[PDB]
Write a protein that binds this ligand. Structure first.
Ligand SMILES: *[C@@H]1O[C@H](CO)[C@@H](O[C@@H]2O[C@H](CO)[C@@H](O)[C@H](O)[C@H]2NC(C)=O)[C@H](O)[C@H]1NC(C)=O
Ligand SMILES: *[C@@H]1O[C@H](CO)[C@@H](O[C@@H]2O[C@H](CO)[C@@H](O)[C@H](O)[C@H]2NC(C)=O)[C@H](O)[C@H]1NC(C)=O
Lengths: 50, 50
C-alpha cells in the first residue's frame, strides 16, 4: 500500500500497458453502442426485450 | 470415466466456473443475433451473400 506508486521505473511501463487496455475498451464500447443505438431506432421492442 | 462426477468438492467449483462461461456465450449470441436479424430485415441480399 505504501510501495505502490513510489517507483517510476516500475510504474512507467504499467501506465503504458494499462493505458492501451483502457483505450481498447473505449474503442469497443463506441463501436458497439453505435450499432446498438441504431438498432433500437428501428425495432425497440426486440432490443428492449433482449 | 468412473470418477468424474463423484467428488462434490471438486465438481462444485467447476459447475460455478463453466456455468459462467455458458452464460457469457448466451449473452453474446443474443446480442449478435439481434443485430444480425435487424440488418437482414434492411438488406437481405448483403446478409445472405456473406
Ligand atoms: C501518484 O500517487 C502518489 C501516491 O502514492 C502521489 O505521491 C504523493 O504526492 C504528494 C504531493 O506531492 C506527496 O506529499 C506524497 O508524499 C506522495 N506520496 C508518496 C508515497 O510518494 C503522486 O502525486 C501521484 N502522481 C501523479 C502524477 O498524480
Ligand atoms: C451427476 O452424474 C453422476 C454420475 O457420474 C450421477 O450419480 C449417479 O446417480 C444415480 C441415481 O442416484 C445412482 O444410481 C448412481 O450410483 C450414481 N453414480 C455414481 C458414480 O455416483 C448424478 O445423479 C448426476 N447429478 C444429478 C444432478 O443427477
Amino acid at each position: 500500500a505504501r510501495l505502490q506508486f513510489t517507483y517510476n521505473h516500475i510504474q512507467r511501463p504499467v501506465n503504458d500497458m494499462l493505458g492501451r487496455v483502457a483505450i481498447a475498451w473505449c474503442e469497443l464500447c463506441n463501436h458497439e453502442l453505435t450499432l446498438w443505438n441504431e438498432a433500437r431506432k428501428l425495432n425497440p421492442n426486440a432490443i428492449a426485450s433482449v
